[PDB]
Amino acid sequence: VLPTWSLDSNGEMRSRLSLSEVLDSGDLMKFAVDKTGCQFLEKAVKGSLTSYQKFQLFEQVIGRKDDFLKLSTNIFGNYLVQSVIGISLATNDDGYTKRQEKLKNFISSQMTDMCLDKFACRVIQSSLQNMDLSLACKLVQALPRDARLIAICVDQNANHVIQKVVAVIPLKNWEFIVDFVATPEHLRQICSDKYGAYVVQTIIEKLTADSMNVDLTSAAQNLRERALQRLMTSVTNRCQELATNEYANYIIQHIVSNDDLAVYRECIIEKCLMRNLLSLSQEKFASHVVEKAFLHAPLELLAEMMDEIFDGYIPHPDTGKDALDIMMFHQFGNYVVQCMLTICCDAVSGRRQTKEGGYDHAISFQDWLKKLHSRVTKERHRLSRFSSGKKMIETLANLRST
RNA sequence: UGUAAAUA
């Protein structure tokens, strides 16, 4: 409970309290971990403070290592820590240089243990984006280099610290993270994780030369391009493992979907998806990758993808069903055929550009459309029993009347 | 007919 001097006749905290009564009391730690007490502290802290009130606040909250961690790891104290940090960064007295290098020492001492903590992880992120950049970078160097970094990316709380590091720190200071993920054995465990799959995507987004990186120098673009390729080369060598994974399929989709990654989207399709379209279309998670490939492939690779589905597999020696018959009725493959039909119809309707590579590839979309149109025409009775077939039939009819 | 993130 709170200190006995701070309660009233009925055991509840007295009204009309001041900030220096508790600061002079030396009982701030009792106030910071109580809900009502910390509710009063963090509101009296947002008001105008004297230079000595800040002096007491800095020493009592971020002045001792053990007491600082005890508040950062506390459900209530972690909020008071973050506000005192902002006052330390807004008070340019003498102790400004000593206070945050001292604060950097306290978290670098307990880096991993704090990211894995549910409440201390917020002190890492807030200090990463609010401290001086020169000191926020030395914080990133405190990250482990061994198996503890794998546990940090896959942690429910610690994964956001790395996503924060990627967001507010220049790449050079966390370039080692890219290589730690780039190594084959670590790439498997992290991409296959519920939270690690999000970490990998966030790294690629910052490593992408899109509109959110036009402020970089070309020297910074070269360093980004070096880390970009290095990560892609590992991902593409393990692409089939990542494409069929529950979580890692979102990374192969993110690469193929992005126009600013078209150089690597073409390498995913050619060295992993090609010659495996029928197989990957029947996989629960890889079928989403197959859809994104059809939607975002360049028209030359799109032709080889179409021709593979239409004429890349031997028909069944007894029934005679080709890959089109198999996919149209498959529990997952039917969406891929629906993706092919939507693309072809979007092209002949003006909803999709047909000029690419200095030529109008319209005649090929019409060619692919006739193939689908006649298979749906010939199998209209068997397709009408399925939800997938009813949408293919009405799509062709809706296009007919345009 | 088919899938994903943590504080009062």
Numbering used by the authors: 167 to 568
What do the authors of the reporting publication say about this deposited model?
We also tested the binding preferences of an FBF-2 R5 AQ/Y variant that we identified as an in vivo substitution by genome engineering (see below). The AQ/Y variant is most similar to the WT TRM, which seems to impart preference for A4. Finally, the FBF-2 R5 AQ/Y variant demonstrates a recognition pattern qualitatively more similar to PUF-8 than FBF-2. In the case of changing specificity of FBF-2 to that of PUF-8, we have demonstrated that a minimum of two amino acid changes (CQ/R to AQ/Y) can swap binding element length preference, but they do not impact curvature.
PUF proteins, named for PUM (Pumilio) and FBF (fem-3 binding factor), are an exemplary system for understanding the divergence of RNA recognition within eukaryotic RNA-binding protein families. Eight PUM repeats are arranged in a crescent shape with the RNA bound on the concave face of the protein. Each repeat contributes a trio of amino acid residues, termed a tripartite recognition motif (TRM), that directly contact the opposing RNA base.
